């Protein structure tokens, strides 16, 4: 009943509407800092010289953007990977021109989101649950690190991290395809399999459970009222669902164990997104997608184009156009 | 060849700018998220129904009893995220709804692109940028990328057109 | 910026009209209970 122990007990209390926890003690200020700076910058920040060539890119709503085109623009290439906090600028005017808000937002956000993951562990422990929901969230979290930190580290500059904007996101992924060919990289192909298969199995599971709801209601009422929060009995018939799905395909391609089924639901998209985050994190060090450019030639030696060469023509167009005033030398080596 | 299809649609249709695709994206990413978050919640709110460290064996397809605690799952997510599911039927219907709707939305956008009815441009942006050579946004930067995609891939991608683009007309930035 | 002037009323009714619809149905649901 000392001041510290009381404080510890409030921080870890399971009676708080929103759990705080020790990870929350870091998460809350860092997320509030990131959020408040993000909203203000998105609305009112002036143009930012993202590529360090004194060519400022306007990202905020008051400087002529809408919701789709607006962004918080990445920090200047002149800064590269240097730490650029506010107190390192001669003035806020300078900090804004060179892209300081980006660095403030992404570092606070990554910290806050890492703590979000730990906080998912922590509350699970306080409630006597199994611990691994936080491992599912490591897949999205890893993906955010990849585009905001790891890729900028490998390329040498936060100016090549993903913009905090909708069209800026697209710019990022187009230029990534020209410089890396993410599409011909197997870790991206597994990320697609992870999210497509994730959407598929979401629909499957939802439709099979919804297909086998036990009749508990009249046709004049939502069938959802046939389930009461906390009832002990299951609300659908898994044997009927299995009897339907195993005939749709064949018997042994259908689950009859709900625990294996839900583990599979968890595992497939998490693992696919781990791979795609590792794709970005390894193309950060320029180990790029397969290059089959001019791989097929004829008896004489003429090049016989494949669809890979057609991809290469599109990549070339993205390459020669991007950051059109920023290259003085023939190779875009970073 | 599908990879080439994607890139074609970026350069010619600016398909990423299309809100029907955007709704599709939300639906597929949202479905994947739902899939992962539901499987992990169930697996981490299981009831102890057997003594083994392999918790799979303690489920029987004919048991009537729920195998995980909706109540503890609801508390966890309410305190972590603010909101949680409380209705199992709604939860699983929502899992049907999200990706099915997203895919339907994207199909609609592609129908429009059948007619070149694109969401290619913002007119306000183009008027300003035409008049003000210091105005630049991520929207104008991506259209330069599209213009490169089209000019650099059309001759080989559309061989029946007999496009001959001499070097001097290819759009290119400095040095590259 | 030279935006479509009618975008504003378009956006306003797009928000207002379905939102009002829901609120009407919600409030008359509460006053049954």
């Amino acid at each position: 009943a000392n001041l510290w122990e009381r404080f510890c007990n409030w921080v870890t209390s399971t009676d708080n509407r929103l759990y705080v926890g020790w990870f929350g003690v870091i998460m809350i200020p860092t997320l509030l800092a990131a959020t408040i700076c993000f909203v203000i910058a998105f609305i009112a920040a002036p143009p930012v010289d993202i590529d360090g060539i004194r060519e400022p890119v306007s990202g905020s709503l008051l400087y002529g953007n809408n919701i789709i085109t607006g962004a918080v623009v990445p920090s200047s290439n002149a800064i590269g990977l240097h730490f650029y906090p506010i107190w390192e600028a001669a003035s806020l005017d300078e900090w804004l021109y060179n892209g300081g808000p980006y660095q403030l937002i992404i570092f606070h956000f990554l910290l806050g989101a890492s703590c979000y993951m730990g906080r998912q562990w922590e509350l699970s422990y306080r409630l006597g649950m199994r611990p691994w929901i936080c491992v599912a969230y490591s897949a999205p979290l890893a993906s955010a690190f990849a585009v905001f930190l790891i890729y900028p580290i490998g390329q040498g500059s936060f100016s090549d991290g993903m913009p905090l904007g909708i069209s800026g996101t697209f710019n990022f992924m187009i230029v990534f395809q020209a410089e890396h060919n993410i599409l011909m990289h197997p870790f991206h192909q597994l990320g697609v399999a992870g999210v497509f298969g994730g959407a598929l199995f979401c629909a499957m599971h939802g439709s099979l459970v919804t297909s086998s709801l036990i009749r508990e209601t009249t046709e004049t009422e939502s069938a959802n009222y046939g389930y009461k929060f906390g009832q002990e009995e299951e609300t659908y018939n898994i044997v009927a669902a299995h009897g339907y799905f195993g005939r749709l395909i064949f018997q042994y391609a259908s689950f009859n164990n709900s625990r294996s089924l839900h583990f599979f639901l968890a595992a497939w998209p998490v693992v696919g997104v781990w791979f795609t985050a590792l794709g970005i994190s390894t193309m950060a060090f320029n180990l790029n997608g397969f290059n089959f450019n001019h791989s097929v030639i004829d008896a004489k030696g003429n090049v016989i184009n494949t669809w890979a060469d057609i991809i290469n023509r599109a990549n070339l167009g993205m390459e020669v156009m991007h950051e059109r005033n920023a290259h003085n030398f023939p190779l875009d080596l970073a | 060849a599908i990879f080439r299809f994607l890139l074609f649609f970026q350069g010619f249709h600016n398909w990423t700018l299309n809100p029907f695709h955007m709704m599709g994206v939300a639906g597929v990413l949202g479905g994947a998220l739902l899939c992962a978050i539901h499987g992990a919640t169930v697996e981490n709110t299981l009831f102890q129904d057997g003594e083994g460290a392999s918790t799979f064996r303690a489920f029987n397809p004919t048991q009537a009893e729920e195998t995980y605690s909706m109540v503890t799952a609801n508390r966890f997510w309410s305190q972590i995220f603010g909101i949680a599911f409380s209705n199992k039927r709604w939860l699983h219907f929502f899992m049907l709804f999200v990706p099915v709707t997203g895919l339907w939305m994207s199909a609609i956008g592609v129908v429009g692109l059948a007619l070149n009815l694109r969401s290619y441009d913002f007119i306000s942006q183009e008027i300003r940028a035409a008049e003000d050579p210091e105005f630049e946004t991520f929207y104008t930067k991506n259209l330069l990328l599209n213009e490169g995609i089209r000019a650099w891939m059309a001759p080989q991608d559309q061989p029946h057109e007999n496009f001959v683009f001499p070097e001097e007309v290819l759009p290119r930035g400095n040095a590259l | 910026m030279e935006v479509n002037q009618l975008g504003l009323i378009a956006t306003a009714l797009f928000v207002l009209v379905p939102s009002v619809f829901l609120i009407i149905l919600y409030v008359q649901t509460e006053s049954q209970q």
Binding site: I67, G230, Q231 | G82 | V3
Partner: peptide, 30 residues
């Protein structure tokens, strides 16, 4: 006017988050 509209909708969503969390219908056991 467009800026005002974008920010108004965004602020209405934040306000909705607040009611949805603190003024939700309480889940009640059975």
């Amino acid at each position: 006017m467009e800026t005002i509209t974008y920010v108004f909708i965004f602020a209405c969503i934040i306000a909705l988050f607040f009611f949805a969390i603190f003024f939700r219908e309480p889940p009640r056991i059975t």
